[PDB]
Amino acid sequence: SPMYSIITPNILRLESEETMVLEAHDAQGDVPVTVTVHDFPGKKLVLSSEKTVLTPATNHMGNVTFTIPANREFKSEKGRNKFVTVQATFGTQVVEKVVLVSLQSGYLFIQTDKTIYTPGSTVLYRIFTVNHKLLPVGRTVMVNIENPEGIPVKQDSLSSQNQLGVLPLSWDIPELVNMGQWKIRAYYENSPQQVFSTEFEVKEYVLPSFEVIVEPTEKFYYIYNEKGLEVTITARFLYGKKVEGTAFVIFGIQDGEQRISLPESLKRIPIEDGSGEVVLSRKVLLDGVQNPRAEDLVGKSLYVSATVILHSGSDMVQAERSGIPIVTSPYQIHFTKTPKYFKPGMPFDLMVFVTNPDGSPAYRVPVAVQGEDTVQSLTQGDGVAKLSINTHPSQKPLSITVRTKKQELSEAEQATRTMQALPYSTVGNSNNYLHLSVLRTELRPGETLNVNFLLRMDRAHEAKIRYYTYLIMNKGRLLKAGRQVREPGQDLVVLPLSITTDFIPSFRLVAYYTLIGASGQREVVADSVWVDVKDSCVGSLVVKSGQSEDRQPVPGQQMTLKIEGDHGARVVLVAVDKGVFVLNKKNKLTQSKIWDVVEKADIGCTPGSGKDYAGVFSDAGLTFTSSSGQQTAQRAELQCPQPAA
Amino acid sequence: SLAVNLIAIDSQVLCGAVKWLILEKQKPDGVFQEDAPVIHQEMIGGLRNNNEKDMALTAFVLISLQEAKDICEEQVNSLPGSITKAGDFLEANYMNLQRSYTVAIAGYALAQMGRLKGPLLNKFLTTAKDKNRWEDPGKQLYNVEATSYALLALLQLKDFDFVPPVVRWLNEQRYYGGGYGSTQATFMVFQA
Ligand SMILES: *[C@@H]1O[C@H](CO)[C@@H](O[C@@H]2O[C@H](CO)[C@@H](O)[C@H](O)[C@H]2NC(C)=O)[C@H](O)[C@H]1NC(C)=O
Numbered sequence A: 001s002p003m004y005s006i007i008t009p010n011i012l013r014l015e016s017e018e019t020m021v022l023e024a025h026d027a028q029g030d031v032p033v034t035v036t037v038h039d040f041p042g043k044k045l046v047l048s049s050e051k052t053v054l055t056p057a058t059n060h061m062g063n064v065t066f067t068i069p070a071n072r073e074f075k076s077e078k079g080r081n082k083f084v085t086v087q088a089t090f091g092t093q094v095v096e097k098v099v100l101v102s103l104q105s106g107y108l109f110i111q112t113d114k115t116i117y118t119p120g121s122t123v124l125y126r127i128f129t130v131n132h133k134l135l136p137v138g139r140t141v142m143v144n145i146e147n148p149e150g151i152p153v154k155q156d157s158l159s160s161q162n163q164l165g166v167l168p169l170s171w172d173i174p175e176l177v178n179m180g181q182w183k184i185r186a187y188y189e190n191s192p193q194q195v196f197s198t199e200f201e202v203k204e205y206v207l208p209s210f211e212v213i214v215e216p217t218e219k220f221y222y223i224y225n226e227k228g229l230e231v232t233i234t235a236r237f238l239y240g241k242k243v244e245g246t247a248f249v250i251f252g253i254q255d256g257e258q259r260i261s262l263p264e265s266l267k268r269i270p271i272e273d274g275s276g277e278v279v280l281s282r283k284v285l286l287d288g289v290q291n292p293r294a295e296d297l298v299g300k301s302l303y304v305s306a307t308v309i310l311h312s313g314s315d316m317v318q319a320e321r322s323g324i325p326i327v328t329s330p331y332q333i334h335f336t337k338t339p340k341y342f343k344p345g346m347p348f349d350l351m352v353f354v355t356n357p358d359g360s361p362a363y364r365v366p367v368a369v370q371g372e373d374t375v376q377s378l379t380q381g382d383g384v385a386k387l388s389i390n391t392h393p394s395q396k397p398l399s400i401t402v403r404t405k406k407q408e409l410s411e412a413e414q415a416t417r418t419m420q421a422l423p424y425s426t427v428g429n430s431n432n433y434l435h436l437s438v439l440r441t442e443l444r445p446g447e448t449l450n451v452n453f454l455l456r457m458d459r460a461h462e463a464k465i466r467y468y469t470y471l472i473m474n475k476g477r478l479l480k481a482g483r484q485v486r487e488p489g490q491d492l493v494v495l496p497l498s499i500t501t502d503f504i505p506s507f508r509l510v511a512y513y514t515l516i517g518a519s520g521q522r523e524v525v526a527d528s529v530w531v532d533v534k535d536s537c538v539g540s541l542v543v544k545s546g547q548s549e550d551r552q553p554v555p556g557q558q559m560t561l562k563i564e565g566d567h568g569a570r571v572v573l574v575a576v577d578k579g580v581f582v583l584n585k586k587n588k589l590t591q592s593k594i595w596d597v598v599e600k601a602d603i604g605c606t607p608g609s610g611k612d613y614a615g616v617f618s619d620a621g622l623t624f625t626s627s628s629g630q631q632t633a634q635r636a637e638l639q640c641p642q643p644a645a
Numbered sequence B: 001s002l003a004v005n006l007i008a009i010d011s012q013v014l015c016g017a018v019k020w021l022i023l024e025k026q027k028p029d030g031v032f033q034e035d036a037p038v039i040h041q042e043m044i045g046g047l048r049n050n051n052e053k054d055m056a057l058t059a060f061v062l063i064s065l066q067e068a069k070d071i072c073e074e075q076v077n078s079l080p081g082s083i084t085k086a087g088d089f090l091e092a093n094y095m096n097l098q099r100s101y102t103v104a105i106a107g108y109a110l111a112q113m114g115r116l117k118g119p120l121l122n123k124f125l126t127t128a129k130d131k132n133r134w135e136d137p138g139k140q141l142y143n144v145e146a147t148s149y150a151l152l153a154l155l156q157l158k159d160f161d162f163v164p165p166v167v168r169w170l171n172e173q174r175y176y177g178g179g180y181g182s183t184q185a186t187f188m189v190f191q192a
């Protein structure tokens, strides 16, 4: 008989849309499908809507949607796991599966007008309330303001319905206050365990009139450098003119969370032409430490503290550069974007993520496989290099070691990393695989991407493969799915995929085929891959000057603010002196941190592939269950398993 | 009575069994009488012992009817008068009991009505040995079966000072059920 199949994500979310993808395999004629969601454990029936008919004109496909409500009965358990049950009845044959549920319902982002405030001043703050799709939602938010030792002093409750997801609010700081770090915490009413937070500082200050930049030549220190670490000083007024003064600068060492200061590292340099330069030599650093070994210095970090005063002597700025690593290697190699599962006897692609010692991506550094010097490649803009091997059918794990080949640098300076990949397990060791391959570029919305599907099986069963089934996972929900048909002899087929703004910042593609092979046994073989998308806005808000002349306008002058942006959008504004940010630039919100928060909320844990077809879906973040019996592995943990590191 | 939270038990058949037990198989003084003992005599557990059998069998059916009271109070209006007649019989002949099994099963039956008080409570407390079990001489299966009803009585009476030695004793025995003649013992220890 035909086999019925249901595909859904691993984890379902409250107060948001959830995609449900229904398919029948090898089916004949129409088959009606009714859909039901029950609770777990027991039966109280939470959703009984939706039905559809799988049609051979549609290749027995049918995608239907639903939404999970939450009430006082759902929100009851807040600390431990709870589950629900999805029911779909294909004609007379029912297929059902228990699903893990997350209690999260969206995102909260908090903007403050300043990052640091005075006693007796006003704090202006806007809370943006969005769902999981980063679209404005109208819900009730509970916000609290806490003291340095954690005492809530002011709390609010308000709904953003019909306000386009914006809650503008205000509060006045009393003069009776304890200076230090103050915290704003917020959570939705229907998700009290998901707590968002951002911080600010309270201090007694006046703004400075200039900024001081401390610039290391390299953002690391190589221990055997006889010259030592060079740190360039740049100082200029806030309106952009050069600062004349004298700087006092001192160095120090950070080991873990504890900082150690080097007292004799103090120097005194004049700041001329808006600049200065100071060098901490290798002898002074080794004289500062009481351990004469250079080997124990590896793994710790340095910090610089500077104090600059103008030659008028009327103002003073203290700046700090910190977290500068003491390392043997100017690069860090990671297999973080490489799958740990190879296909035996089929070539395998390696995506090598190389960074600078601080963590910033390295640009145009050549790396090579340890085996054979001929296979070399340079990193792209995002710090990713493309390597590949021609795999043998070894059922033994394959160790992969990658080492950089950048010129002039010694072998002690060449970084390296060693991992061990694992073989794909076919059903019954049939050696019938699916291999995916794709371009590796920075993806912008509007480009097309060629997806390549390679079939490997004996030719007696190649005529039974008439289609592929693909799905797209993006931001923890199914965005698109469908069939790609195949005629016999076409082991490779190509599917163009157009990139839209919905695919930002990263997405996973899964694909599979199915048949009855070997001795009359149902076989499922799958494959997956993770693709990075260039981080950008879904829309495009730009702020520029309306005037084209009268550079540096007069205080109080009228000027035209020109705002280009998407039609129908609501924009919020704040204009801040940069001298606030020279005092404290921490906790500034940006679009890149927004996509970083979404990537930290991703339910997929691996850059593709897997130990089997079930491991492919489970690592991608998907659940599968068939009427014949083949289904995904059970998952009862929301978080991803931690690597050994 | 436990499966109505799991599957769709027919209410007309279930309270029909309750009506058939009250009218046909209950004497007018409160005693339930069995007219066909089971083929597998091992699955009844400690009820196979013929000593104090009429008191123990009356307590078993009374516990089963009181747990199915909420569904069948609407269907059969003679249920609480049947419970009162059976309860009067067990309360009057309670102090004559000697087995720790019969004291325990009557204790949970009397506790749901609220009649396990005073000397009936004191005899129930002093029936326990080492303050963690209600033991009878013989196999350990009957003693764990007996202590299982008494732990349900302590939870019904809402006296939780005497409960944690009993549950700690049940975990120390390490009983996992199954086996020849284990049907009553396995079902009651996990419900407890
Ligand atoms: C008085 O207020 C201060 C804050 O001005 C509090 O003491 C602080 O406690 C934190 C730890 O939570 C320390 O990090 C600060 O250094 C402390 N401030 C000091 C010592 O000035 C506290 O509420 C009160 N402390 C005293 C000593 O009276």
Ligand SMILES: *[C@@H]1O[C@H](CO)[C@@H](O[C@@H]2O[C@H](CO)[C@@H](O)[C@H](O)[C@H]2NC(C)=O)[C@H](O)[C@H]1NC(C)=O
Residues within 6 Å of the ligand: A063, A064, A479, A480, A481, A482
């Ligand atoms: C699932 O079904 C919905 C039907 O509501 C599809 O939405 C339509 O898709 C077609 C073709 O992509 C568009 O031309 C229509 O404009 C869409 N409907 C609306 C109201 O906009 C959806 O694309 C299907 N998705 C999958 C993965 O099959």
